[PDB]
Design a protein around this ligand. Structure first.
Ligand SMILES: CNC(=O)CN(Cc1ccc(-n2cncn2)cc1)C(=O)CSc1ccccc1Cl
Ligand SMILES: CNC(=O)CN(Cc1ccc(-n2cncn2)cc1)C(=O)CSc1ccccc1Cl
Ligand SMILES: CNC(=O)CN(Cc1ccc(-n2cncn2)cc1)C(=O)CSc1ccccc1Cl
Lengths: 258, 258, 257
């Protein structure tokens, strides 16, 4: 046994750390860089320019670093960056960026991306996220830390998925999801907050209550989004956790001079 | 000429019956057992401990016997069991069980599992079922005989799908589906009974009528589930087919002491 | 050479001189591939299949496979693909059945994105876009310039009209008239694909005529028969409206009442 299967294809211009493993019938294309302790399964296609960090696991039938088919993209040298300790399951597609945004699709650390998920050009994923089977980010999607997207969740171009937020299965998301919020259906509707998530992060009980009141201000009291932001000001100064929620709504809603 | 492609990989500890066929670039991992007359296509990944029965057909890009990514599972030696005369189409994922249930994902006989379907840990499928393209069982799902799940049907953890039942396409099922019942939408709603299915099994005309009346008792007459079960008692003693229906509702609805 | 030594080419396959085939791809019996086409790695082609010129087919695609429909009993049905198509990763395309025309057919300049499914006997025109995980159950006709957003599902026998547009996660169970936009599960008509008309450089008079046509069919309490009658004037005035009328016409025979 060697760590790189003789049946794999490694481009001369690829750069692999010493203890990387690559399974049989995998392609590591030009300008792919792979960090210490990462494991590429069999039947994987990597394409560049792509940087993959340390201790990742990528499973069979995944195409990572492919060009978007968007007719916007004309063959420019855009990037894909993946951090550390990620798991990418079978059949996942991840596309590199486009020059019209930041020229980079980026993924953080400790993420779990389950089978057949799609991560479109220019998307940005944080840390500790979970994208369940067949979740699809159309492009330019920002997913902040600890978010969970249930299976077959679809996200339109440019949407922001907030920290600790949660989508139900078969959700079709067309607007930002504020931090902590749970959404369901097609089209997606806000229902509650992800209290399970807050429990696991060990939030105080006072903070959990504050976040429920915050939900009610925004969603259950007839406030416009402007009026809600004003009402949340007190509660956001009292609790770092509520400030995250206010900040996610703030940055979603410029509006127009009326 | 041998029936196992020289380009395939067969683990020393795998056990294949005499006339098994394996296509090129397929992996038959450690502790996989394959029965008489089964055909593995090209580009298939089998992983163990897995037992596959006789006269199965498994198509390209399928990963059968993989570990769930559920953070619940910590690497214990769980099983997958597949029966006889099944067809598993391209890109299907089937996961082995978890110690927290029965340590076994199990599939019966004569099933058709179409492209890109997912069968989660600890799920149990009976005989003569059809899972259409991209049907997903989240885990611990029991599918009883002759069920049909239309394309892109999603099923939450722990749901029971009844015998001869039928889901429409893009269904999102969160509670049990009684036998014979047809459900549609996200979230799934009961609509009618799968009379097409009863026709194919050659049910008597008296039994079909009895099952329609049974549907009406449970769904269209303002009965509580307890009151419906009581009303069905007569009809379930008269017809084996109605007993299947009553039994599926019975075993769905312990409830809580009120 | 342009054919990877790690690929498998059946003796009975017929490849034009400058076809490229990636490693670990199978070009099965009775597959024909035209000038300038590129097959990626890890592709499975099966026949009888005819693929035209300047196509690009990506990894993990199974093109020309038999339907699993229990209707089909192993007869030699066909798949035909035209010119300048792009088929992205993981796409499945099935050949036809003897119970229809024995042929699944795809035109020119189409883009079929990852994990899309094209069921037996479906017919796709030109310039269409099927986005990730779009699924045509079978016998589906998609006319020119249609766009099906991601995870759009289409029931057997539906006609998707020219320039029509489905929103994401649409579940389509009846015909979609030309130009119409539909959304949801079950799919509902909302408006017309004006963006699409802009790109084709339709006249401004034609765009207006098509909006009025939408209103006749959908927003004025007309039966479909009454709408067709009302559209007759406007369809003679504008080729673009005739496409719309014709899509509704051919959707609605009905029964003698
Ligand atoms: C266990 N809970 C559920 O399965 C509910 N869930 C959210 C969810 C799922 C998984 C996790 N984690 C897994 N490892 C750690 N966390 C967390 C939340 C869904 O996405 C349901 S749908 C589905 C589920 C699985 C496969 C296909 C489909 Cl379609
Ligand atoms: C033939 N009938 C349908 O196709 C209707 N239906 C239920 C259904 C489907 C198949 C079967 N069988 C196949 N062999 C025997 N039975 C029976 C009922 C759907 O799943 C439509 S959606 C769909 C259909 C096909 C591919 C992708 C998608 Cl998304
Ligand atoms: C950029 N436009 C959108 O992504 C909106 N849209 C329709 C659409 C999409 C793309 C195109 N084109 C691409 N090249 C040329 N045209 C046109 C219309 C969706 O389908 C969203 S969902 C989706 C999108 C992509 C992957 C997975 C999924 Cl789920």
């Amino acid at each position: 046994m060697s760590l790189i299967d003789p049946r794999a294809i490694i481009d001369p211009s690829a750069r692999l750390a010493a203890d990387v493993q690559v399974g049989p019938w995998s392609i590591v294309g030009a300008e792919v860089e792979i960090g210490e302790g990462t494991v590429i399964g069999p039947h994987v296609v990597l394409k560049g320019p792509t940087k993959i960090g340390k201790h990742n696991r990528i499973y069979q039938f995944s195409s990572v670093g492919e060009d978007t088919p968007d007719l916007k993209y004309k063959g420019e040298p855009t990037r894909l960056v993946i951090g550390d300790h990620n798991v990418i399951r079978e059949g996942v597609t991840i596309h590199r960026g486009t020059v019209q945004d930041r020229a980079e699709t980026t993924i953080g650390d400790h993420n779990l991306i389950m089978a057949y998920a799609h991560i479109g050009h220019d998307s940005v994923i944080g840390n500790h996220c979970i994208l369940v089977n067949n979740t699809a980010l159309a492009g330019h999607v920002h997913v902040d830390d600890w978010a969970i997207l249930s299976g077959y969740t679809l996200v339109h171009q440019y949407c922001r998925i907030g920290a600790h937020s949660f989508s139900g299965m078969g959700s079709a998301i067309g607007k930002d999801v504020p931090a902590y919020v749970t959404v369901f259906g097609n089209p997606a509707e806000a229902r509650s907050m992800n209290f399970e998530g807050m429990r696991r992060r060990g939030f105080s009980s006072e903070a959990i209550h504050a976040l429920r009141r915050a939900y009610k201000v925004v969603y259950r009291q007839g406030h416009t989004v402007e009026e809600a932001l004003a009402e949340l000001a007190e509660s956001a100064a009292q609790f770092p956790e509520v400030a995250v929620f206010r900040d996610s709504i703030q940055s979603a809603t410029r509006g127009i001079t009326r």
